[PDB]
Design an enzyme around this catalytic site. Structure first.
Site, mmCIF file in Angstrom:
data_model
loop_
_atom_site.group_PDB
_atom_site.id
_atom_site.type_symbol
_atom_site.label_atom_id
_atom_site.label_comp_id
_atom_site.label_asym_id
_atom_site.label_seq_id
_atom_site.Cartn_x
_atom_site.Cartn_y
_atom_site.Cartn_z
ATOM 1 N N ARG A 12 1.145 7.069 -0.110
ATOM 2 C CA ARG A 12 0.174 5.654 1.021
ATOM 3 C C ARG A 12 -1.238 5.651 0.597
ATOM 4 O O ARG A 12 -1.918 6.915 0.341
ATOM 5 C CB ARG A 12 0.092 6.412 1.909
ATOM 6 C CG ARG A 12 -0.602 4.964 3.032
ATOM 7 C CD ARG A 12 -0.122 4.087 3.506
ATOM 8 N NE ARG A 12 -0.888 3.439 4.635
ATOM 9 C CZ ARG A 12 -2.447 2.702 4.662
ATOM 10 N NH1 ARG A 12 -2.677 3.004 2.733
ATOM 11 N NH2 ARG A 12 -2.400 2.310 5.278
ATOM 12 N N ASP B 92 0.890 -1.137 -0.118
ATOM 13 C CA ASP B 92 -0.221 -0.115 -0.317
ATOM 14 C C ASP B 92 0.767 0.690 0.286
ATOM 15 O O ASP B 92 0.439 2.312 0.059
ATOM 16 C CB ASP B 92 -1.114 -0.243 1.222
ATOM 17 C CG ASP B 92 -0.320 -0.019 2.242
ATOM 18 O OD1 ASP B 92 0.534 0.357 3.036
ATOM 19 O OD2 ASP B 92 -1.329 0.031 3.362
ATOM 20 N N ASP C 277 -5.766 -0.980 3.899
ATOM 21 C CA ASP C 277 -4.455 -1.843 4.367
ATOM 22 C C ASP C 277 -4.140 -2.677 4.662
ATOM 23 O O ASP C 277 -4.601 -4.245 4.288
ATOM 24 C CB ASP C 277 -4.890 -1.476 6.377
ATOM 25 C CG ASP C 277 -3.590 -1.919 7.000
ATOM 26 O OD1 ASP C 277 -2.903 -1.183 6.937
ATOM 27 O OD2 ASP C 277 -3.886 -2.201 8.040
ATOM 28 N N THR C 278 -2.866 -3.536 3.810
ATOM 29 C CA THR C 278 -2.322 -4.275 2.957
ATOM 30 C C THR C 278 -1.245 -4.617 4.538
ATOM 31 O O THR C 278 -0.468 -3.803 5.246
ATOM 32 C CB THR C 278 -1.354 -4.014 2.222
ATOM 33 O OG1 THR C 278 -0.223 -3.069 2.516
ATOM 34 C CG2 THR C 278 -1.967 -4.015 0.930
ATOM 35 N N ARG D 191 4.222 11.406 3.832
ATOM 36 C CA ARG D 191 3.154 10.962 2.698
ATOM 37 C C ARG D 191 2.421 11.051 2.061
ATOM 38 O O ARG D 191 1.144 11.427 2.525
ATOM 39 C CB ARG D 191 3.270 9.224 2.996
ATOM 40 C CG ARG D 191 4.992 8.312 3.218
ATOM 41 C CD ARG D 191 4.292 7.136 4.159
ATOM 42 N NE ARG D 191 2.858 7.318 4.686
ATOM 43 C CZ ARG D 191 2.416 6.144 5.184
ATOM 44 N NH1 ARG D 191 2.944 4.844 5.695
ATOM 45 N NH2 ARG D 191 1.805 5.914 6.395
ATOM 46 N N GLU E 124 1.935 -5.930 6.444
ATOM 47 C CA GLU E 124 3.210 -5.593 6.161
ATOM 48 C C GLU E 124 3.748 -6.451 5.186
ATOM 49 O O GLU E 124 3.668 -7.516 5.708
ATOM 50 C CB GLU E 124 3.675 -5.391 7.106
ATOM 51 C CG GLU E 124 3.547 -4.818 8.494
ATOM 52 C CD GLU E 124 3.231 -2.839 7.720
ATOM 53 O OE1 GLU E 124 4.204 -2.291 6.922
ATOM 54 O OE2 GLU E 124 2.455 -2.449 7.260
#
Ligand SMILES: Cc1cn([C@H]2C[C@H](OP(=O)(O)O)[C@@H](COP(=O)(O)O)O2)c(=O)[nH]c1=O
Ligand SMILES: [Ca+2]
EC number: 3.1.31.1
Length: 129
Positions: free
Chosen positions: A29, A15, A34-35, A75, A37
Site C-alpha cells: 500500500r 495505490d 489516497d487514490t 500490507r 477506489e
C-alpha cells in the site's frame, strides 16, 4: 531511507501493488496517498496510471519509511519507484491521488508530495477539476 529491490507480481489499483519482495509475495500500500477506489470517479484512471507505471519499469524499488512497515491488513507500506521515479509522488502530481494517511511514524516524503499536490491543484488536474 533506502531503496530495496522487488519485482512486480501484479498491479492492483491506484495505490496498491502486489510484488515479490525478498522472495515473498507481498501486497504494498503506497504511503502518504489516497487514490479513489476503482468504482469512484478517477479510480480507473488511477489504477491505469499506476499499472502502466509499474508495468513499464525495468527496475522497481521499494522504500520503507521509519515507522511501521506493514499495516493492520498485512500490507507493506512503502514509497514505490519505477526506474527511479516515485509512483506515490507521481500520482499526486497528476491529481490522481490526494495526500493522505499521514501518520507520525511514516512521513519522510510528506512535503515533497504536498508540493506536488499544490501544483496538481494549481492546474485543476483530474481530481481537482
Ligand atoms: C496508507 C495507510 C493506510 N492504512 C490503513 C488505514 C485504513 O484503515 P481502515 O481500513 O480501518 O479505514 C486503510 C486505508 O487503506 P485503503 O485506502 O487502501 O482502503 O489502511 C494504515 O494503517 N497506514 C497507512 O500508511
Ligand atoms: Ca484508496
Amino acid at each position: 531511507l533506502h531503496k530495496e529491490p522487488a519485482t512486480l507480481i501484479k498491479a492492483i489499483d491506484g495505490d496498491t501493488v502486489k510484488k515479490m519482495y525478498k522472495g515473498q509475495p507481498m501486497t504494498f500500500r503506497l504511503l502518504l496517498v489516497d487514490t479513489p477506489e476503482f468504482n469512484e470517479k478517477y479510480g480507473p484512471e488511477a489504477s491505469a496510471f499506476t499499472k502502466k507505471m509499474v508495468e513499464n519499469a525495468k527496475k522497481i524499488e521499494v522504500e520503507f519509511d521509519k515507522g511501521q512497515r506493514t499495516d493492520k491488513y498485512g500490507r507493506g507500506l512503502a514509497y514505490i519507484y519505477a526506474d527511479g521515479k516515485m509512483v506515490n509522488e507521481a500520482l499526486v502530481r497528476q491529481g490522481l491521488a490526494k495526500v493522505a494517511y499521514v501518520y507520525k511514524g511514516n512521513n519522510t516524503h510528506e512535503q515533497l508530495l504536498r508540493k506536488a499536490e499544490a501544483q496538481a491543484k494549481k492546474e485543476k488536474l483530474n481530481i481537482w477539476s
